[PDB]
Amino acid sequence: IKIMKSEVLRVTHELQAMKDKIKENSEKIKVNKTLPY
Amino acid sequence: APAVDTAEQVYISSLALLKMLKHGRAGVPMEVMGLMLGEFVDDYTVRVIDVFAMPQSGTGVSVEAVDPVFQAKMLDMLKQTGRPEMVVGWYHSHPGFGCWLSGVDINTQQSFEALSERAVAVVVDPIQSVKGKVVIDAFRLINANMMVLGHEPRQTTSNLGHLNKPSIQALIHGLNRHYYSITINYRKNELEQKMLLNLHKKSWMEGLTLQDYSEHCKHNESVVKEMLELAKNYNKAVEEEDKMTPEQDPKRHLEEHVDVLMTSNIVQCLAAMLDTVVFKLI
Numbered sequence: 001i002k003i004m005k006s007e008v009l010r011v012t013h014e015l016q017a018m019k020d021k022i023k024e025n026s027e028k029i030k031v032n033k034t035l036p037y
Numbered sequence: 038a039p040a041v042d043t044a045e046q047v048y049i050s051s052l053a054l055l056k057m058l059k060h061g062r063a064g065v066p067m068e069v070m071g072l073m074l075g076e077f078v079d080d081y082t083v084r085v086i087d088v089f090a091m092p093q094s095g096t097g098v099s100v101e102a103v104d105p106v107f108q109a110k111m112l113d114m115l116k117q118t119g120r121p122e123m124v125v126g127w128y129h130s131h132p133g134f135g136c137w138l139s140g141v142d143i144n145t146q147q148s149f150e151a152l153s154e155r156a157v158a159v160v161v162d163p164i165q166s167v168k169g170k171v172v173i174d175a176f177r178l179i180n181a182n183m184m185v186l187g188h189e190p191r192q193t194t195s196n197l198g199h200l201n202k203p204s205i206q207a208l209i210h211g212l213n214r215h216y217y218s219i220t221i222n223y224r225k226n227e228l229e230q231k232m233l234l235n236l237h238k239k240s241w242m243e244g245l246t247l248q249d250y251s252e253h254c255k256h257n258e259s260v261v262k263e264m265l266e267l268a269k270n271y272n273k274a275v276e277e278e279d280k281m282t283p284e285q286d287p288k289r290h291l292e293e294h295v296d297v298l299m300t301s302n303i304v305q306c307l308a309a310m311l312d313t314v315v316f317k318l319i
Contacts, residue, residue: 034095 042081043191043198043217047157047175048224049085051233058171060090061130061163068098068130072108074115075125077155084224085159086122089115098129099141100148126157133164136174137210146178146216157219174207176216190217245316247308253301260298267291 049057053073060069071090078084089111094102112124127149131137138146138158146158159175166172179190190213191198198220203212212218270287 031093031095 039080040188040190040192041155041177043193044195045081045083045191045219046197046222047083047085047159047219048078048222049159049173049175050087051223051225051229053085053088054171054173054223056088056090057128057159057161057173058163058166061132061161061166064093064130065132065163067093068132069093070098070102070127070129072103072111072124073126073128073157073159074112074120074122076122077125077153080155083125083155083157083219085125087115087120088128097141098145100145103127103145124152125155126159128159128161130161130163133162135165135204135206135210136160136162136172137207137212138176138216139210143178143211143215146176150178158216159219159221173221175219175221176212177219178216179214184214245308245312247312248305253305256301257298260294260301264291264294264298267294 057071060071063069069090071088073085073088075083075085075087091103092107094104096102108124115121127145129142138160142158142160146156149156149158155177157175157177159173162172183190193199201218201220203218207218267287267290271291274287
């Protein structure tokens, strides 16, 4: 039952970090998708 | 008041030029920008050892397009790596617009020169840099107080600064009025020359590799047919020459064809004999 707890910890770390990378992706998206279309 | 000499040179290293060209092409049709690392050896020399690109921004090419944090971490990480060179200047690409400084370019250059008085603003044209010529100029600035009062922007002590002539496209956009073009020179030692020579250094093999024989006969037949036609043309021209006082020529094209036939046939024959000799069962 311990290995699934370790997997839960690693998956919550992955979620917490790839939240930041997806927000950085959104920032770069807006950096292209700015305004004067 | 000290004045920058017209003999000042921007010594851009070879890999710096390669990186600038590659980044400028990569960003086409957008405009790119990166910071230049190097050292100001003296008043009359600016050495650009290396240049690093910067992330593309929605602003374009401005002083808000250079972000502080990426610049800081890049500088610190390169200093850790082994390139502890201060930022000398900035570069940006004008794709097909020629080499000059626009108003925003001048504003960014004023911002850069606030950091240090010596700071070049070299720009490059990625699409006009077709094989052969490379379109890249370097401008620093002209102080407004310097120009308004009457003095020349730069003192002259030699002919080094007058070897190259300014372009009309640069001149209209403010050259010799708000900025001066700094003579550009490429630092290329023997080692990098030899390394870059490997790009087209074919091999030790093709010097011995025979061309296809049937292809060789077909090529020889084609060139000898052209020889026959050109010889008819030359005979007709000579027959006119006697009925001609001194008053494309078939002879010249015949000379080029005979040259290509000679070199191809001699090369193939000599290579065949060499493979016969050295490439032997014994």
